[PDB]
Symmetry: C6
Subunit: 93 residues, 6 copies
């Protein structure tokens, strides 16, 4: 009995646009900032978790804020991520 739903992701080119996204994501909805990763070629991803409605609102707000200061490469909301995807997500905690 070990204790540890939706996932929202924004990937930008550059760290500052990513921080703008994360700030807007947290300010706009009841979500938890749970992921942060830089993979090279200047790509930086911020990840949030929370209820589906909250995550969708958070990603929309993050996109608007990031798009005004940098390049957003992509964005995604996964409503119910597969359990096995947690193995990748915890690597960017």
């Amino acid at each position: 009995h070990h204790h540890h739903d939706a996932l929202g992701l924004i990937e930008t080119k550059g760290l500052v646009a990513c921080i703008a996204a994360a700030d807007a994501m947290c300010a706009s909805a009841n979500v938890e900032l749970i992921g942060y990763e830089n993979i090279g070629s200047g790509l930086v991803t911020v990840m949030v978790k929370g209820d589906v409605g909250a995550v969708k609102a958070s990603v929309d707000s993050g996109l608007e804020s990031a798009q005004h200061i940098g390049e957003v490469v992509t964005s995604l909301v996964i409503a119910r991520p597969h359990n096995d995807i947690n193995k990748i997500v915890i690597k960017h905690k």
Copy 2:
């Protein structure tokens, strides 16, 4: 007597498209998410293992899901990988 078949791989430009691929791969077939690697230039690879039919279905589903949110660089199914290729695959476990 030490105890540890097909391999499916999707490589994308960017982490979010890779996570979309991994999620679709796991949801669409009976496969295990066994590999994850980022090599620079924003290239990220997710790898799955399972029976041949399952791996083929998993890679097709991952490709469709990833292509709608990012750039897929390439994809491959190796039905019976050579034993020596395990030496590279375990580096990205």
Copy 3:
């Protein structure tokens, strides 16, 4: 009762332009140089903290100085960053 407002960021392509920005940022206003990060693709970010007016003056000065010797990718002032953004900012301390 543990003891540890505005955040200013400049992202450049190349380290020398970033150092020119950080020097001008510190010289032009009462701010603290609190962040420094390199994320690949030659992107380097310098971060400062202080009162809002000070941070705005610091970022304007850093931009002018960096733009004369290199490429500024972007700049931003976050007047009151969300508490959860501190989790990302301390990673680049």
Copy 4:
């Protein structure tokens, strides 16, 4: 009296094309997969060792297999590598 000939190398842009090359290299000839390295800009190199004829056959097969799924940057067979080159090769073991 310490105990530890030809070297075959394939460099691709992307990991999946490299794994396709390594698989074909091992399947097509009596060679040992002895090197694997990622140097940035998405460049990945796989290295094999064995008898000259075997290494030449292995590199030709690896090239054909990799070219069908990704970009091969270059390939090379060194029949009798200089002893001092072992100092670089062991870094990518």
Copy 5:
């Protein structure tokens, strides 16, 4: 009473052009080679310290030498760097 002025920087694309710059910088003036950093995208920076006149002469000489063998991205002399910039400079010692 702890004991540890001008800063000269040259940033090139590639390590060899950087080493050519550092060699010319040291040969042409009474400066100390105090910094060396590689930030990705092949950008390499060499930093020297000394009296203002010496640093200016050193950077001019380094630029001429590096420009003949590679790409110089940028160069800068900071006559009296802000004390807080030492926090970034010591990271590349």
Copy 6:
């Protein structure tokens, strides 16, 4: 009384072209392979040391061999490197 002249460098885009250069460098002259570094953007540098004539012959041979299989970014021979440049060179030993 601590005991530890010319320096030859070849920088290529990609590891295989670099290994081809290092092999030709060692085979063509009485030089020691003393440096090897990868700095990102796929740039790889090999460095040799020896007598001036030997180093010049070694770099010419390395260039010819590398140019036939990959991109040579640059090459250089420093006949009598400044003592302070040893501080950078030992970082890539």
